[PDB]
Amino acid sequence: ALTQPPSASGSPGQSVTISCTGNYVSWYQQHPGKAPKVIIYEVSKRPSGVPDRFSGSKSGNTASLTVSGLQADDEADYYCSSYEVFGTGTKVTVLGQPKAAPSVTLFPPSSEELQANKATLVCLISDFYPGAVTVAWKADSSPVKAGVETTTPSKQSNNKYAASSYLSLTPEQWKSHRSYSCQVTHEGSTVEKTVAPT
Amino acid sequence: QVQLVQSGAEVKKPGASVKVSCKASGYTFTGHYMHWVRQAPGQGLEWMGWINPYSSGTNYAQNFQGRVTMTRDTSITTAYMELSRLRSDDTAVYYCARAPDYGDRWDFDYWGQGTLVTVFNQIKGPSVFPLAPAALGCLVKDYFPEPVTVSWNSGALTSGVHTFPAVLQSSGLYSLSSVVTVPSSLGTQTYICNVNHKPSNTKVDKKVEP
């Protein structure tokens, strides 16, 4: 019941703001391959060991977590929790390397796959920094949630990130809908790739 | 000092049961609640339930009621959480966290190192379908387990080949896509993708053309 922005980033020394729309509010910092740690509790209070550069606030139905003077250690996942409900999460990056726009390539289901009563939309994203995207499949303008399987960004051989998203569809619904789109958002930068049957 | 050391990594099968321990020391074991939270690889945190170490009373989550059991041991100050009817979608890292005090019971000030569970199941020969273009590739769908080696023209082409990481589907099977970049040249050069999966002994070559 808690919604967070998919991505948020800033250069070393900048500041970023992470929203949490849904009482008290608490935030967690989780480095990759590590357990979550409390950094914010009771709206804006901080535990011991958390530097003063971390701060929080709440105004209405949304609470914000702001980190000032960004450091390399701040590059991690952040979640907001209300009692037991956890948020979607936000990926923070200290813009370590120059920014790069994602490259999107969408493939329609193959003829051989359709003969086996199967269909899969392969959307491929590569060469994007920071490593955080927002893939939302569109079926004639209406988003579809079922059958969506999206990976998480992983380091490439050029310090950038790569990911892949798949939309499993049946042959009947693939032919019925006019077209499908793979819209990916990279910190407010949405690029849409659309494919159509035949 | 407060420590929470859990059990080692476990591998189970669909329908099996796994028990995870949580060794507690350096604090009043029965004075602070113990909570269990799981997180799938690449997903968010999901609260499962809390158990009072004093009265052994539990309050499970709605989506886990009738499937998870949480116990505690006073003599060895260890909390336990056993989950039955494991599925391929239950692969997650499970952490045990401590309520900071009596009044505050949700700001978990201490977390365990985690216990990775790996619900394991059906192997399967991968299904290869060409991706006609420009860029052309092949779709390795419904295979298990990792990894799969994908080449082009028996290794003749290696520039522009991008083997994207596989996706952990809800069915427990991985799906990987490898594509190449071509000048498009499509009618002259022939492209064949060689996928080899040693665990299932499946090697199929598929030619991709527009």
Author numbering:
A (entry chain R): 3 to 9, 11 to 25, 31 to 91, 96 to 210
B (entry chain P): 1 to 52, 52A, 53 to 82, 82A, 82B, 82C, 83 to 100, 100A, ...
Sentences from the paper on this structure:
In a double-blinded, placebo-controlled phase 1 human clinical trial, the recombinant, germline-targeting envelope glycoprotein (Env) trimer BG505 SOSIP.v4.1-GT1.1, adjuvanted with AS01B, induced bnAb precursors of the VRC01-class at a high frequency in the majority of vaccine recipients. These bnAb precursors, that target the CD4 receptor binding site, had undergone somatic hypermutation characteristic of the VRC01-class. The GT strategy for inducing VRC01-class bnAb precursors is rooted in the hypothesis that these antibodies target the CD4bs with a similar angle of approach to VRC01 and use the same conserved contact residues. To verify that VRC01-class mAbs elicited by GT1.1 do not just exhibit similar sequence features to VRC01-class bnAbs but also target the CD4bs in a similar manner and with the same atomic contacts, we selected five mAbs for further structural characterization.
Moreover, VRC01-class bnAbs have very distinct and targetable genetic and structural characteristics. Specifically, they have restricted immunoglobulin heavy chain variable region alleles (IGHV1–2*02 or *04) and a short five amino acid light chain complementarity determining region 3 (CDRL3). Finally, GT1.1-induced VRC01-class mAbs are structurally extremely similar to VRC01-class bnAbs. A subset of isolated VRC01-class monoclonal antibodies neutralized wild-type pseudoviruses and was structurally extremely similar to bnAb VRC01.
